[PDB]
Design a protein around this nucleic acid. Sequence first.
RNA 1: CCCAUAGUAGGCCUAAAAGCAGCCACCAAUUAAGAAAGCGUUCAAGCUCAACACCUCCCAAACAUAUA
RNA 2: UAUCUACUUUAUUCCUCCCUGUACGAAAGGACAAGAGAAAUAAGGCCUACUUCACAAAGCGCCUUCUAAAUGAUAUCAUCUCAACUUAAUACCCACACCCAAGAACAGGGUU
Lengths: 156, 59, 73, 146, 157
Amino acid sequence: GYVPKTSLSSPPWPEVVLPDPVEETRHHAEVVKKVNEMIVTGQYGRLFAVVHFASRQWKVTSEDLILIGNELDLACGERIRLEKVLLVGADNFTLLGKPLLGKDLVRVEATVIEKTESWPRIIMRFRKRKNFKKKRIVTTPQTVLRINSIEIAPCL
Amino acid sequence: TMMERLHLFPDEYIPEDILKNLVEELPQPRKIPKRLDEYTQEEIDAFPRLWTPPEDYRL
Amino acid sequence: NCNVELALTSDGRTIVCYHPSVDIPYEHTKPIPREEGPMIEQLSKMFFTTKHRWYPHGRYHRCRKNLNPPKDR
Amino acid sequence: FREVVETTIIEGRITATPKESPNPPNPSGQCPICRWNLKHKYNYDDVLLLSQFIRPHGGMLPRKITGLCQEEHRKIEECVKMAHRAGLLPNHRPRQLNRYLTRWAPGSVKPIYKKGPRWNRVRMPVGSPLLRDNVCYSRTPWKLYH
Amino acid sequence: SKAVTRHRRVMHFQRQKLMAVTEYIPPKPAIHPSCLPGLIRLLRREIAAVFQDNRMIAVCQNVALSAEDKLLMRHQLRKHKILMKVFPNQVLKPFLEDSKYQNLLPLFVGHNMLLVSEEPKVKEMVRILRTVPFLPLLGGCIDDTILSRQGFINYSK
RNA sequence: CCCAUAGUAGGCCUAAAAGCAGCCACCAAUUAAGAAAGCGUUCAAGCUCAACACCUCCCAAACAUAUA
RNA sequence: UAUCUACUUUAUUCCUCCCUGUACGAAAGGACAAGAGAAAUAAGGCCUACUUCACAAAGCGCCUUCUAAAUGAUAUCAUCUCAACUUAAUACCCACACCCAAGAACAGGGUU
Ligand SMILES: [Zn+2]
């Protein structure tokens, strides 16, 4: 049970003790309460939000633009509530979900700017001495969204 | 160019025009071992001495 | 540098992290104090780059360089 | 121990012989190493043990005196070599390139003038295979050959 | 390449992976086991009959004589009824402890020569042991009383 | 590491070949040294073993300590 | 009839004498090292002589060339120790035009 102070006796990594969950959940409760006061009193500037739209996550803030490589099945100019927010932070605090934030807590709202297609892209196949040469020209449809607002609710 | 960014000096002596630019002293990767000389009294006293030498041995 | 405050919420679905900025203390601060080959050599030694960066390029490379590149932000 | 004092009168005098420390945490062993839970818990670093188990001129005591088992007597032998050549024992002299973990004597190692191909490369031995059975606090094991 | 070759043939890599995976793993012990915790009866009878044979015993230091020298000393000791006896001391210590020889225990170690007899003629062994300048007459015991060397001189005189 | 007497220079044939050129017995003394295990001599003499008594120019660079 | 790569100024040996026919060995035999010579080759130069020869280039000519001892443990003797120790490159080079010992061109040196 006892090993004296020796090079391979103690671990090289520094010893750390995790606090027992009683005062830790007290600390968690006061931190969540105080962040809730910062939300309800407007102690945030502008907010950023990692948002899982079509198949990929975007670091979305207000007032900005996103390009999406598919038809969205919407005419231009309609607004959108992007569900699947999965991180929302400000200058002083963040709120990240497991794996998502609730729909009562974050409202991220976007507008459909434009419905274009991509530039003509080249798909060319070539195997040598086998006379193998094929060429295809693709243009993938795209929609550009204007994120309008990322507002937050004091429900914690 | 990366190799020309780096400056090597063989001794403790560094020119003054480079000592005015440093910011962080990186930690040495290897844990330096220490000899009998750098042991204090409390360190060797805190270490328990392990065995019976025979009373009659010449060394 | 390490000082933030983490907290799982009550039902345990979101993680609330709190992180104010650490301001630099006043006591941790200082007061404000108040030919052609040799040219390439001097510029190389002054900017800690090789000599090869400083020789000019021909007209073909000077013409392909974009003069009004797309600017973001 | 005892000392042979000569001046011509020559005599042998016993002086200042230690004993066990007051408690071993795991008694009923055969060797002090097995008795202090140091079976696989030392290195070339710790010259406390290695300072205990040696003569004042860098040599070791025989196993019949210290009572060590064969395995860790050989381990202490190699650790004496590794600690002497690393410069960790400066007061145990008979009467400059920095090293550590030197298995072989630095005076009798031939340079690898022709290291082989990728499948037959002549590696540089680092550390010792006697200390192979140490406690592994590293995620990846010791590389004894570099 | 045939399947039976003069040199060792290189295995297909999947087979070598089999020979590596299936390799014999010997059981590691939890604690290493090295760190875990008619002639003699004849000698007993013979030296026992010797012990209740003699009345006084003298002992010597005889390995320091030549073969011819041991032959001569055997010759001048043959005219007496005395017998000589050497035997290992690790069995002589049970003999000394068995014969309640408490004061003879720290006497019989190393190379020693026993001179069992029943009547005094140690005088001429003193005479012939001044003829060589070594081999002292070691201490003995007459009828459970320790004889020192000055006691040997007094007992001789 | 020690330690090495004696029946005997075992008989037979062999100039003699003695434990050691070869055949056969391989008994026996003190407490114990084999009629003999390797040098060694024409042969001997000497020496060791056991046992008695103490027991074309190499070729990534490198790194054994931080938790699969 | 050379297009592209690559490239075009990085001191030995023999013989003779001395040491010495010393040490060594016991006689026969017989040193090294260092030094002095006489040669030869190679490299680097040079024209005073000789020779081909003549405002100079040459050679047959000349000059210069600098692993080992104790001590010692593991294995208290011992042990050279994949035991610890201790001891036994300089130089060279570097700020128009006319003639040239400089040179294919360009360059380079001199022009008081
Ligand atoms: Zn043990």
